[PDB]
Paper text:
Laccases (EC 1.10.3.2) are multi-copper oxidases that catalyze the oxidation of various organic and inorganic molecules (e.g., mono- and di-phenols, polyphenols, diamines, aminophenols, aromatic or aliphatic amines) with the reduction of molecular oxygen to water. Substrate oxidation occurs near the Cu1 ion (named T1 center), and electrons are then transferred via the Cys-His pathway to the Cu2 and Cu3α-Cu3β (TNC), where the reduction of oxygen to water takes place. 2D laccases are homotrimeric proteins, with Cu1 ions of monomers lying in one plane at an equal distance from each other and forming the so-called equilateral triangle.
Diffraction data from the crystals of mutant forms, excluding double variant His165Ala/Met199Gly, were collected at 100 K. Diffraction data from the crystal of His165Ala/Met199Gly variant were collected at room temperature. There was no significant difference in the overall protein folds and conformation of amino acid side chains at room temperature and under cryo-conditions. Combining Met199Gly and His165Ala mutations did not significantly increase the SgfSL activity, but led to a drastic shift in the optimal pH of 2.6-DMP oxidation to an acidic pH area. These results indicate that His 165 regulates oxygen access and participates in the proton transport of 2D laccases. Surprisingly, the optimal pH of His165Ala/Met199Gly variant was pH 6.5, while single-mutant forms Met199Gly and His165Ala exhibited maximum activity at pH 8.0 and 9.0, respectively. Apparently, in the absence of His 165 side group under conditions of an increased electron flux (due to replacing Met199Gly), shifting the pHopt to the acidic region provides sufficient proton flux for oxidation 2.6-DMP by the His165Ala/Met199Gly variant. The catalytic efficiencies of double-mutant variants His165Ala/Met199Gly and His165Ala/Arg240His toward ABTS and 2.6-DMP are nearly identical to that observed with single-mutant form His165Ala. In the present study, the His165Ala/Met199Gly mutant retained practically the same high resistance to azide ions as His165Ala, and the resistance of His165Ala/Arg240His variant was 3-fold higher than that of the wild type laccase.
Author numbering:
A (entry chain A): 40 to 319
B (entry chain C): 41 to 315
C (entry chain B): 40 to 317
Amino acid sequence: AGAAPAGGEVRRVTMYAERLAGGQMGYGLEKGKASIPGPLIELNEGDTLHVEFENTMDVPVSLHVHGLDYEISSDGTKQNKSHVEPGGTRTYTWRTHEPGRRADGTWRAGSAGYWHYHDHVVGTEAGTGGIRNGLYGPVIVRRKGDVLPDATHTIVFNDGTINNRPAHTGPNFEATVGDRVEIVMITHGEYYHTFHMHGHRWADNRTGMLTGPDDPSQVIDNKICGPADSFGFQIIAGEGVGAGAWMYHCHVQSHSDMGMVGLFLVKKPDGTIPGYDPQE
Amino acid sequence: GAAPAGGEVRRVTMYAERLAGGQMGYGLEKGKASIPGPLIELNEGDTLHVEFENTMDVPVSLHVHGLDYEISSDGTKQNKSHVEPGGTRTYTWRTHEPGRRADGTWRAGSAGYWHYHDHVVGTEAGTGGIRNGLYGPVIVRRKGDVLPDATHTIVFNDGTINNRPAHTGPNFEATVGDRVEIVMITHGEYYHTFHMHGHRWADNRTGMLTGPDDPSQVIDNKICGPADSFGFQIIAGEGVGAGAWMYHCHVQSHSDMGMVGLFLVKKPDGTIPGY
Amino acid sequence: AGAAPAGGEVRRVTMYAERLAGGQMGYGLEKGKASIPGPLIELNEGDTLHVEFENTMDVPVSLHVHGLDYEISSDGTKQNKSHVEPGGTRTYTWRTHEPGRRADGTWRAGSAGYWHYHDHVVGTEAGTGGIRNGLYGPVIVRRKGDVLPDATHTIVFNDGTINNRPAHTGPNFEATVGDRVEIVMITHGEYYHTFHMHGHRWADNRTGMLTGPDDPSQVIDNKICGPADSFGFQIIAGEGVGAGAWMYHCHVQSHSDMGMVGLFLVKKPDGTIPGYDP
Ligand SMILES: [Cu+2]
Ligand SMILES: [Cu+2]
Ligand SMILES: [Cu+2]
Ligand SMILES: [Cu+2]
Ligand SMILES: [Cu+2]
Ligand SMILES: [Cu+2]
Ligand SMILES: [Cu+2]
Ligand SMILES: [Cu+2]
Ligand SMILES: [Cu+2]
Ligand SMILES: [Cu+2]
Ligand SMILES: [Cu+2]
Ligand SMILES: [Cu+2]
Ligand code: NA
């Protein structure tokens, strides 16, 4: 609800790749608690994260991150020998940095943004099978003073599924009118998609919010995305539109018909959702 | 011309009608339905009540992008805001100005290039309705936005422009110096790239740069997918002159198969060099 | 670093379309030196370029440019009769302009940006055969004060290939840690792609670098593009990540599996690449 602090901490987490039911694989922070999508990793600009990574599987797996600073030995590719053999262990190091003026007078961009990590080694040296099986997760890097949300939810279009779930099964998210909700939106696989939210909109820039009246960024409620794109935004749940079962879906028509649909359930402060009949 | 501040309450009648050969269109008067539907233009703060009547024998709905509306004007079967055959229904669209919220952040205004379309014909995503022609443009202006001399709507709907047969345009005319506004909407199954000859715009809300500090990329080509919408303004023939200036989808098989048209920019006498 | 001057020069260049091996076709500034992609053309806003064009092929060809100012007679299309006949010649003229205030108070965008040129006429009236055969290349228009790079490399996604090369053959690019490297990224053909670089990122705006702390442009390392899109950016090779063989690839999974992959080789000051097996 406040603002992101300045970074600079050194953080440590243990991560596991495990098989799940149905031929799927997931990352998790504790043995037996892997999920799809993987756990959310949140860092402030300047932080260093060491991932003590254990592969509990019987096939090689890796961890590759978009956006952040990492040396070649934390690449997560077979090519640079930064994959993890079955039963093996590896320490991955992710660094982040603040923006700032260089000596040549140019502006060096910071790490802040909506990013993601995924496998690069299962199935093919591009991770095609590992990604398909669920080896993916979100990474948020915040800049000093960024508005922090009340809740963050992660939406992944993975080929024809949302979060590797069966068609027509959400996921659904709940909020109360006035909550500041953050959506992390990641795409993977073979297909392009368009992400659409009923009754809400956002700015097409780093944070999803206009910086002020001078920000010329387009305001949208529909965004085309391709494999390994990531973006995020913050909305005020129900702002100007009120409570109800607000649909989000891919707007590619056949994807919508296949079941790439979910609900943003926005409740009144008394817990009620007007008009909501879940048999409809 | 500059857009004024909004705040007016407006009313319109809208109808859904069957058209020739399987098509469906929206109209503001009975018998006047078109594809694309009629252009709805609002200034931030305006409120629009759409008194809607379904004259067809199947259910139909009206759902809008970008604008403020309560759940009862969602236009989805899921929330029971569709319209039965022969039935009527008032949809209410609101708009708002930008402004600082109490928490200190900036609330985006409604201004932008938007669209409305059906959400229940064929499927509960409106696949059949959109295919048949139930879509149209919506422009919300901010106080002080530059107003054009004309506005043209280009809809890439699957493999057609505005549901027209291949190789039939549409073509639009202007005169050298005209301030021409383009609304560009995409629907259906396919991604597209929209491409203009002789002209370019900025990839931001209005299609024009705000000034020398605007870092937005200036482009003559834009990828777009189903339900994307954007717009821009150009001075017809600026720095390039009169002529028949192609626009087309730049996916090669789409241009070859007929997603092509002309922007006919005339000299003041009415002639178009080379055409 | 270097900075771009103001423009306003009138330049003249000769350009040829020639046949190459394997049914391919390319542009070149000297007979017998056509290449795919075609030669890089760099202008400063305000420059005028006259292209004295010669078609050495047996089919009509044309030169169509994006983003720049040109009259209908340099449009490069059959419908405007601005193609070039077999063995014919034609002068194409491209102009550019600075940004400025129109008399009505609105701001006129400048010509600066990452653009490209290509055929519009070989095979179909959209140039489908010409583009597939290799008739395409980069144009960079710079604005006064834009920072200049140490090196510019052009990557073109054309259908399922990079730069019409066979699958998995790169191209690979070399730099030394700290080099200011400029990438021009053009897409052509039938398919959408996503372009991804390992270890590096850029700003999604005109130059690929933030203007400063007020610039809200998304910073990205992955970008969707479709036929005839062009963008570009500059990076500092290895900045914050070090030397290594840094993969770039289309991130559409089947495309990377089929060979839309290449290497950005960032060398230590002593010319070696840690962990890289030549
Ligand atoms: Cu990556
Ligand atoms: Cu989709
Ligand atoms: Cu919608
Ligand atoms: Cu919808
Ligand atoms: Cu990746
Ligand atoms: Cu198309
Ligand atoms: Cu063009
Ligand atoms: Cu929609
Ligand atoms: Cu063209
Ligand atoms: Cu690709
Ligand atoms: Cu990769
Ligand atoms: Cu083109
Ligand atoms: Na932008």
